């Protein structure tokens, strides 16, 4: 119930939101550090995914922390030090001492504390970021009483951005970390942009006339303590009050009773049966994989062709074995017509298609509006019909400098008469004379016998409706086949036997990647089980079939006798014959419906209050 902060800056009121960020696990076994004069412990703790610095203070002991990789003037390291004058934040290659400390001296003649030793780093060569705060006066006076001030800090390192969250709460506890709930808020964002894998705590050193000896032994340690916690990425539920401050939080991975609140999206759980999940581990990494074909697609040839095909005999090109970069197409002002249905712009870069079909032809403005999937006319019904479930779309622009010359441009023809409706994705080249009446039309251009092909008059002086437009139609097909054309997204590495979110060839999901011995036929890429769930991935980068294991596979029934009534709960596992369970515990009872733990079984027979299954009933008694 500690370390909960605001993951985003979006203001929320009376709405519960589920966030997946790096948060403090509930009731975590954090390490305790003690420093009593009567134990100057300043170790180096690794920086895996975040350090939660919880410290209580009464005499201004903890000053700052050092962040870096090697801490030996070989890699970039960050300084945060708060001396008696200002706040210093620097990012340089500091040569750190073995035991850095800050020395504060005391005089017997006059009651005053003044800092005189600054032993943190040897020298700094190259510096990138430096921050100096406003000057202030700091007491630095020891107190003979108990602890008064509690300071909590959150450190996060994502994409090179350092965000610090802190909140001051006055406490009066002696040694134990105080309970309760607190909300932390951001104060500054530091774009350090360095890699940090370890950190060391820097404390304060006090000297006076009561500590004889040299510099290495004539000193005392102030009474202070601090704790270090890790921020494992887990899903949490946060309650945002009307004032904008979080007053409580719910963990979705602490206990089976806590997971019921996450599923129900409420802070109170009523009596009943709830199925959250099996033994569940929150994902820690995200991986995306795409084919390593570093070849540019031939989009330019289709859109910059010297000669465009006719309306009836429209060219068709197949695009494959390359990465499709649509950012040159959908981000240009030349394309007069760029309407798409189901393509989902700003997402093409993510999804994968079996193949790309490109059709090139020139038509007028009044007929380029007819390339909608549902339309009728002299073009959409006799020349080129698009299906209702057409995947892909049509790109058109204006062309009067090209394909339009003075004296007429009669090099383009279109179908005018036909005996039947054209099928979708069908091109017909028939020069046979159309017949209207019952008279024979065996190759005669007489009455009631007109040529199906009609010439196009592309005069430069025509109206904007009669202008000749260069039209390119992009067709995408989804088939049960390995994808050979996809987006330009990067492909990361591969991990095994871990609950990791995966993004394979445009398919996203959560699961565990494991080796599989199944043999896959070459033209099939995905496999599904009886439950119609994804179970195998071809992984074209390595061409190895990987089994998909769900992170939670078993059935779990949580017997919660309310929230305000009681807190103890009973967990029932349907597919367990009493182990892959949350906890063994005690009072394990095996029923016909499964294995029940956390509940006491009696030989009596009372009324059924909370049904379990197969004649098993449970109730809350003394």
């Amino acid at each position: 119930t500690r370390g909960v902060y605001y993951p985003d800056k979006v203001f929320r009121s009376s709405v519960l939101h589920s966030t997946q960020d790096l948060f403090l696990p509930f009731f975590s076994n954090v390490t305790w550090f003690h420093a009593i004069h009567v134990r100057f412990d300043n170790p180096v703790l690794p920086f895996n995914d975040g350090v939660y610095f919880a410290s209580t203070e009464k005499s201004n002991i903890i000053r700052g922390w050092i962040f870096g990789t090697t801490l030996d003037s070989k890699t970039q390291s960050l300084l945060i030090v708060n001396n008696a004058t200002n706040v210093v934040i620097k990012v340089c290659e500091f040569q750190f001492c073995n035991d850095p400390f800050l020395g504060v001296y005391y005089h017997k003649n006059n009651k005053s504390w003044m800092e005189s030793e600054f032993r943190v780093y040897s020298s700094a060569n190259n510096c990138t970021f430096e921050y100096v705060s406003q000057p202030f006066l700091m007491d630095l006076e020891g107190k003979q009483g108990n602890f008064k001030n509690l300071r909590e800090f959150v450190f996060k390192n994502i994409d090179g951005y350092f965000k610090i969250y802190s909140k001051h709460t006055p406490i009066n506890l002696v040694r134990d970390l105080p309970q309760g709930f607190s909300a932390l808020e951001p104060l500054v964002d530091l774009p350090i942009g360095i890699n940090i894998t370890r950190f060391q705590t820097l404390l304060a050193l006090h000297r006076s006339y009561l500590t004889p000896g040299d510099s290495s032994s004539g000193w005392t340690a102030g009474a202070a303590a601090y704790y270090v916690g890790y921020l494992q990425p887990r899903t949490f539920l946060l309650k945002y009050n009307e004032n904008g401050t979080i007053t409580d939080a719910v963990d979705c991975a602490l206990d089976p009773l806590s997971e019921t609140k996450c599923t129900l999206k409420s802070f109170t759980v009523e009596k009943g049966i709830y199925q959250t999940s099996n033994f569940r581990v929150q994902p820690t990494e995200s991986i995306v994989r795409f084919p390593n074909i570093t070849n540019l697609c031939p989009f330019g040839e289709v859109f910059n062709a010297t000669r465009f095909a006719s309306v009836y005999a429209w060219n068709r090109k197949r695009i494959s074995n390359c990465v499709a970069d649509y950012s040159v197409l959908y981000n240009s002002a030349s394309f007069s017509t760029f309407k798409c249905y189901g393509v989902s712009p700003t997402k093409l870069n993510d999804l994968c298609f079996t193949n790309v079909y490109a059709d090139s032809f020139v038509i007028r403005g009044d007929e380029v509006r007819q390339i909608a999937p549902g339309q009728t006319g002299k073009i959409a019904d006799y020349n080129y019909k698009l299906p209702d479930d057409f995947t892909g779309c049509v790109i058109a622009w204006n062309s009067n400098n090209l394909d339009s010359k003075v004296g007429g441009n009669y090099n383009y023809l279109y179908r005018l008469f036909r005996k039947s409706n054209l099928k979708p994705f069908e091109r017909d080249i028939s020069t046979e004379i159309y017949q209207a009446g019952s008279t024979p039309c065996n190759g005669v251009e007489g009455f009631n016998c007109y040529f199906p092909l009609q010439s196009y008059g592309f005069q430069p002086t025509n109206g904007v409706g009669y202008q000749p437009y260069r039209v390119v139609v992009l067709s995408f097909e989804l088939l049960h086949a390995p994808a050979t054309v996809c987006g330009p997204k990067k492909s990361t590495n591969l991990v095994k036997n871990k609950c990791v979110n995966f993004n394979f060839n445009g398919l996203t999901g959560t699961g565990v990647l494991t080796e599989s011995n199944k043999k896959f036929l070459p033209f099939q890429q995905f496999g599904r089980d009886i439950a119609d769930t994804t179970d195998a991935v071809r992984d074209p980068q390595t061409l190895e079939i990987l089994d998909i294991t769900p992170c939670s596979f078993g059935g779990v029934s949580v017997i919660t006798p309310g929230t305000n009534t009681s807190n103890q709960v009973a967990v029932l596992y349907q597919d367990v014959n009493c182990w892959r369970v949350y906890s063994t515990g005690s009072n394990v009872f095996q029923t016909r419906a499964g294995c029940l733990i956390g509940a006491e079984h009696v030989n009596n027979s009372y009324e059924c209050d909370i049904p379990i299954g197969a004649g098993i009933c449970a109730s809350y008694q003394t």
Partner: antibody
Framework: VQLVESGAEVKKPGSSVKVSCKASGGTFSSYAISWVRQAPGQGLEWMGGIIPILGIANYAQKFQGRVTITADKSTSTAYMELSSLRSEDTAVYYCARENGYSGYGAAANFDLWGRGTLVTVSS | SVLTQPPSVSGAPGQRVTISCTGSSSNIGAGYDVHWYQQLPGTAPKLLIYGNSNRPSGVPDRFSGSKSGTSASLAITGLQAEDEADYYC???????????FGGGTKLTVLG
């Protein structure tokens, strides 16, 4: 029907040639007329085509500024004119009648072919 | 243009001979049908197979063809003494904006 061309001709390296494809026993009304050349020892090449109803000629991208092909609907004849003859252009030319159809592929095919016309150059 | 075929093939009177015509993704891989032509040594070429499944009038039923993927296949059952001819595959090319012809296969059966 039948397609008849002219006899063998001999030209100069850099002269003009003119041959015709006369239809006998019928007319190729509402049927596209194309021309296919074949070098000795090489494969066929597509280099032109006429829809005689509208009199519009479409040429290939291999050469377009040196060959002008024309046809007459009244006499049902197709006339081939070529300029800037070279030594490599020594080949035989056939008048091909296109026969289109409706389908997913819809590729033009030549069912009827001419008897050929030898066009040779000699300095 | 790019309609490469084997330069020559060999066969027997009683054995089947398969001729493969492979192009690219702009002419053959785009779904366009392929037409086959037979050219006797001294006779103008004539249509043999159109639409990858149909046969015109006057052609023997021994000649068979099929198109799948980005390649074309032609199957001949009988190989008589008159079967020595040049075979070409022709389709529509989108990049060239015109018909494209094959390189031709030389079929010679003599002894």
């Amino acid at each position: 029907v039948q397609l008849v061309e002219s006899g063998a001709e001999v030209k100069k390296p850099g002269s003009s040639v003119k041959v015709s494809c006369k239809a006998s026993g019928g007319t190729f009304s509402s049927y596209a007329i194309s021309w296919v050349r074949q070098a000795p020892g090489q494969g066929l090449e597509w280099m032109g085509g006429i829809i005689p109803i509208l009199g519009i000629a479409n040429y290939a991208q291999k050469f377009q500024g040196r060959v002008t092909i024309t046809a007459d609907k009244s006499t049902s004849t197709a006339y081939m004119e070529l300029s800037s003859l070279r030594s490599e252009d020594t080949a035989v030319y056939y008048c091909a009648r296109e026969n289109g159809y409706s389908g997913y592929g819809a590729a033009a095919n030549f069912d009827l072919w001419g008897r050929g016309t030898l066009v040779t150059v000699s300095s | 243009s790019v309609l490469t075929q084997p330069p020559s093939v060999s066969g027997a009177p009683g054995q089947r001979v398969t001729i493969s015509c492979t192009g690219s993704s702009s002419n053959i891989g785009a779904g366009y049908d392929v037409h086959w032509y037979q050219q006797l040594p001294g006779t103008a070429p004539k249509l043999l197979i159109y639409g990858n499944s149909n046969r015109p009038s006057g052609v023997p039923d021994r000649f068979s063809g099929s198109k799948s993927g980005t390649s074309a296949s032609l199957a001949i059952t009988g190989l008589q003494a008159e079967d020595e001819a040049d075979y070409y595959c022709q389709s529509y090319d989108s990049s060239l904006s015109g018909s494209v012809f094959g390189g031709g296969t030389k079929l010679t059966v003599l002894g």
